[PDB]
Amino acid sequence: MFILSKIADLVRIPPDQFHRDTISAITHQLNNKFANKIIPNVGLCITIYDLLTVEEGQLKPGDGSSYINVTFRAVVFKPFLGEIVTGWISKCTAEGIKVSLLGIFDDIFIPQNMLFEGCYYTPEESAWIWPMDTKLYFDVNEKIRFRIEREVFVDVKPPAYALLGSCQTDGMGLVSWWE
Amino acid sequence: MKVLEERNAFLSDYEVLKFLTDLEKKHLWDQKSLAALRPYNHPELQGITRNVVNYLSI
DSSP: OEEEEEEEEEEEEOGGGTTSOHHHHHHHHHHHHHTTEEETTTEEEEEEEEEEEEOOOEEOSSSSOEEEEEEEEEEEEOOOTTOEEEEEEEEEETTEEEEEOTTSOOOEEEETTTSOTTOEEETTTTEEEEEOOOEEEEOTTOEEEEEEEEEEEOOOOOOSEEEEEEOOSTTOEEGGGOO | OEEEEEEEEEEOHHHHHHHHHHHHHHTTOSHHHHHOOOOOOOHHHHHHHHHHHHHHTO
């Protein structure tokens, strides 16, 4: 579910920090720009795993801050196509179920064209029901096992990164259903 | 900013759990050190760092 991403970028270290561990300082500036922030067309960046290469700091004629080109890797949240992810039903809208990785990622949506053949919505109880002969209820706040289907990006509701999920195979759905 | 390779390697669930755990230490963000205590300021990094851990340990 998690991966590393080789990235390159320019950092700006202030004179107020030239006395700090230069590299620890760099890492700071990266988390500053990426920690828990989205990387366009990639995914959710959690933090810097490590630095790989650093150049010499070129100063600007207007402010004593040196600029530095850095090549690094970063721990990114980017589930793959097909993966089986586990989360919690956060909301049952009339068009699908919204999942969450509790504090990690909230943009997981499982639409009706992804549920089991027959699943319908109930605006009275506020949940999605599953038939098979005998009504099973995907209810709010219950752990959900779902298969990731589409990885949706958007240059920037709407969110720069979201994911579509499913529940169409034995085992997927509310977890209490198959343990 | 340029992406050299979005998928450079899979970080196993454990490896993440570790890295993020050892990370909260350097910055004093652990149950123990949080109660015995300025730690690293970063609210967002500290923020998500905890959540990822609370996830993989459940």
